[PDB]
Design an enzyme around this catalytic site. Sequence first.
Site, PDB file in Angstrom:
ATOM      1  N   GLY A  38     -27.540  29.571  -3.986  1.00 60.26           N
ATOM      2  CA  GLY A  38     -27.796  30.910  -4.489  1.00 60.26           C
ATOM      3  C   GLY A  38     -29.251  31.112  -4.925  1.00 60.26           C
ATOM      4  O   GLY A  38     -29.678  32.250  -5.094  1.00 60.26           O
ATOM      5  N   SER A  87     -31.495  29.629  -2.927  1.00 61.31           N
ATOM      6  CA  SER A  87     -32.028  29.518  -1.570  1.00 61.31           C
ATOM      7  C   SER A  87     -32.853  30.752  -1.220  1.00 61.31           C
ATOM      8  O   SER A  87     -32.430  31.858  -1.502  1.00 61.31           O
ATOM      9  CB  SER A  87     -30.918  29.386  -0.589  1.00 61.31           C
ATOM     10  N   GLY A  88     -33.998  30.523  -0.571  1.00 58.89           N
ATOM     11  CA  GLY A  88     -34.934  31.559  -0.164  1.00 58.89           C
ATOM     12  C   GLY A  88     -35.957  31.925  -1.241  1.00 58.89           C
ATOM     13  O   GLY A  88     -36.969  32.583  -0.958  1.00 58.89           O
ATOM     14  N   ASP A 137     -37.636  26.318   7.735  1.00 57.13           N
ATOM     15  CA  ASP A 137     -36.714  27.186   7.047  1.00 57.13           C
ATOM     16  C   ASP A 137     -37.483  28.265   6.310  1.00 57.13           C
ATOM     17  O   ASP A 137     -37.662  28.248   5.089  1.00 57.13           O
ATOM     18  CB  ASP A 137     -35.834  26.344   6.139  1.00 57.13           C
ATOM     19  N   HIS A 180     -32.383  30.075   6.585  1.00 57.15           N
ATOM     20  CA  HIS A 180     -30.951  29.817   6.449  1.00 57.15           C
ATOM     21  C   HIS A 180     -30.238  30.932   5.681  1.00 57.15           C
ATOM     22  O   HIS A 180     -29.007  30.961   5.694  1.00 57.15           O
ATOM     23  CB  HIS A 180     -30.695  28.423   5.913  1.00 57.15           C
TER      24      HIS A 180
END
Length: 223
Positions: free
Chosen positions: A175, A177-178, A84, A40
């Site tokens: 923020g 995320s990942g 994801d 994402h």
Amino acid sequence: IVGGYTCGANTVPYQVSLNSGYHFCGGSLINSQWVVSAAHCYKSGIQVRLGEDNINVVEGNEQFISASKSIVHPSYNSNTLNNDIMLIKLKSAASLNSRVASISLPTSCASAGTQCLISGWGNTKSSGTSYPDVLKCLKAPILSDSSCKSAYPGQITSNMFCAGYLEGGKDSCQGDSGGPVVCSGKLQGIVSWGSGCAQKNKPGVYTKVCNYVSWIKQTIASN
Ligand SMILES: [Ca+2]
């Protein structure tokens, strides 16, 4: 990260910032050429920033390397966030040192109750918006799948797990995320989604990295 702590400069040496003119996502360095992040977080024109503490100040240990290639998981579903996960290849190999270091992929999946370390530069408030400049960290346990599925009925796949605190107050956020969820020195999770941040009965949901090792290894062996 809401309710966490300042990691300390370069104590999380596998943590990367994805930059597209601004920090927008985290990632995990898994060898000198490859970063794992969330699908994402996909966008074109990614610059990977390694060795970061203060993302707003050049402190002297950074390596900024452009992405040559991004590979989104072939079964990534942006609606459900199933699978994801994405791989980013660097245009040139990072120099691995004490401040920039790869994280191991898991050989097996992590157990419920295991305390993991989640890190990133994301929002530090559950209601407000306040972005930190230095890397924040959170220790959080993996939750049982029964409590995860109860928190998010109809939404949890076998490629996801919950970690965090049902009471709320402590969580990853926008923020982050990942970014990495590291448990027992292996990358077991990727910051994926959640309903708000640090809300009661709404823990963080993480991509379950141990389901993807075969894909990661095959992809890396061919790209
Ligand atoms: Ca910096």
